[PDB]
Amino acid sequence: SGFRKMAFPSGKVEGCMVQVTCGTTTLNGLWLDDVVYCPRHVICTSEDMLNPNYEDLLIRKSNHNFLVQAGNVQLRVIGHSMQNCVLKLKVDTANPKTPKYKFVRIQPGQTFSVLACYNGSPSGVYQCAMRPNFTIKGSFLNGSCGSVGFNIDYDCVSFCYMHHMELPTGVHAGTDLEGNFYGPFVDRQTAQAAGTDTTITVNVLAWLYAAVINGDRWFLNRFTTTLNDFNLVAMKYNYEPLTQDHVDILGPLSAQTGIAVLDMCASLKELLQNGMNGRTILGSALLEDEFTPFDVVRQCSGV
Amino acid sequence: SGFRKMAFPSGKVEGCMVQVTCGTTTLNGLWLDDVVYCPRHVICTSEDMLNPNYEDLLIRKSNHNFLVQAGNVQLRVIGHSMQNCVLKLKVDTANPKTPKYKFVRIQPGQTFSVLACYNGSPSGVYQCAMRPNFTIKGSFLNGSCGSVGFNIDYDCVSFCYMHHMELPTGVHAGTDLEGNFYGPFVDRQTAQAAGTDTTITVNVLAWLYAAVINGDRWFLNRFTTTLNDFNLVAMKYNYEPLTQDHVDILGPLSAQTGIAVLDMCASLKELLQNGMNGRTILGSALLEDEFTPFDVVRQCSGV
Numbered sequence A, B: 001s002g003f004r005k006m007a008f009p010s011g012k013v014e015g016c017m018v019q020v021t022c023g024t025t026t027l028n029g030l031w032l033d034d035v036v037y038c039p040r041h042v043i044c045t046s047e048d049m050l051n052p053n054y055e056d057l058l059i060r061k062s063n064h065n066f067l068v069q070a071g072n073v074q075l076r077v078i079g080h081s082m083q084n085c086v087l088k089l090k091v092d093t094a095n096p097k098t099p100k101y102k103f104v105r106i107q108p109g110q111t112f113s114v115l116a117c118y119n120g121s122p123s124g125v126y127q128c129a130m131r132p133n134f135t136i137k138g139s140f141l142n143g144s145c146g147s148v149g150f151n152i153d154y155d156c157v158s159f160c161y162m163h164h165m166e167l168p169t170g171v172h173a174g175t176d177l178e179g180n181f182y183g184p185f186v187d188r189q190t191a192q193a194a195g196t197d198t199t200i201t202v203n204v205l206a207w208l209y210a211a212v213i214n215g216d217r218w219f220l221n222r223f224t225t226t227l228n229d230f231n232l233v234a235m236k237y238n239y240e241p242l243t244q245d246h247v248d249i250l251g252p253l254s255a256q257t258g259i260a261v262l263d264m265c266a267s268l269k270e271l272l273q274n275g276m277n278g279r280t281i282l283g284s285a286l287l288e289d290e291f292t293p294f295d296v297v298r299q300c301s302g303v
């Protein structure tokens, strides 16, 4: 029993983190086979983040402008190229610790683990969700750029996020490992801000199932609801619409608890309309939306 | 910016996890140098957990009764002994991945990372606090016994917890790595239950400082309070007394924010008396007490 925000074990990713310096800027890189991946803004000076032509800065750079350090072993850069908003630095040594891996782009509402790093050295690990507005609510200080987000299945690491910047609201923006930003964000200095966010409805329902599996039952009721009348209430409270696919995805949790999805939807509607009146669910006084149905099943396996 | 429940990178500990089987019971062991540490209840049968004489079961066991598997390599047990509630299984191979390590016992109110494991294979990592009543609120299923809790400083792993059991309330109990239980709990079948818990006051104040560092300021006020009048209110709300040492420990966070500790205490008193009236702090509608002052400083380094 018990339910926690749980990250994947970070060992396989720790072995891939290196330090990348260009000019006076140091950040983190990801060392897989003979390539080091890092944010391309490492080549920017502060005189040129208003409107950097990243191409421009890059043609003016050479291999020796990039210092790559793996622990206390310098790697020699033998090639450099740009892939969207990421740099690929070819090095003369393949990483002996390279795990089986994939580069995957995730969907809003999906979760992943972040290995926060500074100067190529891991500092901590935590779980994030990709928000509907393509930001993440992380914990990132200056120097954390190039830290990565990932999931593990079996022992293949699926990398899904590389960290690039913080927005004025204190949330974070980054790319997939092909260097394509999540959301309408750019690696140049603008007044860019997060657009309007919403609550991940299917995840809230997953977490209510987690609560029932762990013996929190006070919010349950007889009532059921129609999907249509549920989505009418969800819309009013800035919740994403619930689709039939979401209902299907919640199937296994519904079977294990014996609580039909639309039965649980009636509980959520009443929580949205009444609040909790001083009670908590799984230690929370708010409805939690950063656990996917998979997260719940994986952690709550057989109670 | 940002503040998350962050665990230590788990890589150094992942390399120490093995699988231990005795009879039909399988659980996890910790492999350091040529010793494997595991809960002694691995030698119990279900016919004998009412009143096991653990000594008895152990004299009746031989080295070959213990099957130790490290990945897919069986380790040969060449000696076995009991150390309080932990078994020490001497094996014929020293773990080549043994980190620098220490066995440390922690205090109620201190935090640590848990590497949840099943069949010697790590599943996830999360942060726990030792509750004032010496339980932990973890996430543990059958088979998780022998998973360990730890902190890292520099690159020395300080192991502080080994998991043994779940209480009827769904919280968890375990030992230090010398096999001495935290709290009044025993590795035998009783109606044992967690005693009365309290809120870790110094940690709540640390987390309020975290919030201020991250731009959450709405709960602040002019008021200051005396330590005596604060502790009168804390007592009423089941909060631990705040000592002058706690005040001193909060010194650096007070300096960085420019908010005196007793100034922040006045904010906490009003939160305790009024609630938040619909607002949140660092994404929480409850006052969070599982971040130590160190946790905050380490994560909030320079904003």
Ligand SMILES: *C(=O)[C@H](C[C@@H]1CCCNC1=O)NC(=O)[C@H](CCCC)NC(=O)/C=C/c1ccccc1
Binding pocket: A027, A041, A044, A049, A140, A141, A142, A143, A144, A145, A146, A164, A165, A166, A167, A168, A172, A187, A188, A189, A190, B001
């Ligand atoms: C990379 O290490 C660094 C991390 C940031 C910076 C400190 C705050 N938290 C983080 O994650 N990334 C940058 O410094 C980045 C480079 C921009 C590309 C030219 N810029 C930002 O993060 C912008 C912060 C900001 C916030 C509000 C208004 C303007 C700028």
Ligand SMILES: *C(=O)[C@H](C[C@@H]1CCCNC1=O)NC(=O)[C@H](CCCC)NC(=O)/C=C/c1ccccc1
Binding pocket: A001, B027, B041, B044, B049, B140, B141, B142, B143, B144, B145, B146, B164, B165, B166, B167, B168, B172, B187, B188, B189, B190
């Ligand atoms: C070890 O792997 C296992 C883990 C437990 C069991 C399932 C629930 N969550 C856990 O962490 N530990 C045990 O099974 C343990 C062995 C007891 C020593 C003889 N016993 C318990 O955890 C007791 C659970 C319980 C709860 C309420 C009433 C009675 C028993």
